[PDB]
């Protein structure tokens, strides 16, 4: 009998209940099929089986007996921007700042997945030579938090999703967490604020 804590909190304190989510509250929807390929991969320069990925230029080492310049796109793709505010939306990356002091700070090693896909999404045999249009998400497009009603079918005679709110959006599976819809008409009286802890017998609407 195990369970995961779930603290309502929300920077609010009136009576401070808390929930325990067990394996009896949330279940997994069986395997399905969907697309999971969206990458901007680069070309490897394998050295000691630790990867030295670099895409545009040739291999770029450096002096002082240790460095590997794996640079990518940078302010060379900018057009009279500002380096302060007005950049928070669509913020930069590795924001150690270089504008004023004008001295780069060497980051740490790129220890990560190696990846490959020399044929892109055509590993065995495939092609995508067509017009620019007609492209959309496959049957994983069910996003987080989406509330799924009963009898909703992902595919033609497929899995027949149950009631609940999508918790996990894995490559070929979904966790539903269960729920219970209650249809409410105009001029009705909801009993409780948002996220109100509802017990076994208390009312919901008159």
């Amino acid at each position: 009998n195990q369970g995961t804590v779930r603290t309502l909190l929300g920077i609010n304190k009136e009576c401070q209940f808390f929930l325990i989510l067990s394996s009896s509250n949330c279940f997994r929807i069986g395997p399905f099929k969907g697309v999971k390929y969206p990458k901007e991969l680069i070309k490897k320069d394998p050295l000691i089986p630790i990867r030295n990925s670099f895409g545009p230029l040739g291999t770029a080492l450096q002096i002082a007996n240790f460095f590997s310049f794996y640079y990518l796109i940078t302010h060379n793709q900018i057009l009279v921007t500002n380096y302060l505010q007005l950049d928070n939306l669509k913020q930069t990356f590795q924001p150690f700042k270089f504008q004023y002091y004008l001295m780069d700070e060497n980051g740490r090693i790129y220890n990560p997945d190696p990846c490959s896909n020399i044929i892109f999404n055509p590993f065995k045999l495939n092609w995508y030579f067509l017009h620019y249009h007609f492209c959309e998400e496959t049957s994983t497009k069910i996003d987080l938090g989406q509330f799924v009603c009963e009898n909703v079918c992902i595919t033609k005679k497929g899995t027949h999703l149950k009631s609940g709110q999508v918790l996990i959006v894995q490559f070929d599976s979904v966790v539903i967490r269960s729920a219970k819809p209650y249809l409410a008409t105009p001029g009705a009286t909801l009993h409780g604020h948002y996220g109100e802890i509802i017990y076994e017998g208390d009312t919901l609407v008159t």
Partner: peptide, 24 residues
């Protein structure tokens, strides 16, 4: 704690195990 519904809606009850405690 009483709210009112303009047109119509659905009220969901996400299953969980509620407990009362003032030391959280």
């Amino acid at each position: 704690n009483v709210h009112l519904l303009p047109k119509t809606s659905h009220l969901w009850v996400l299953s969980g195990k509620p407990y009362r405690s003032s030391v959280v």
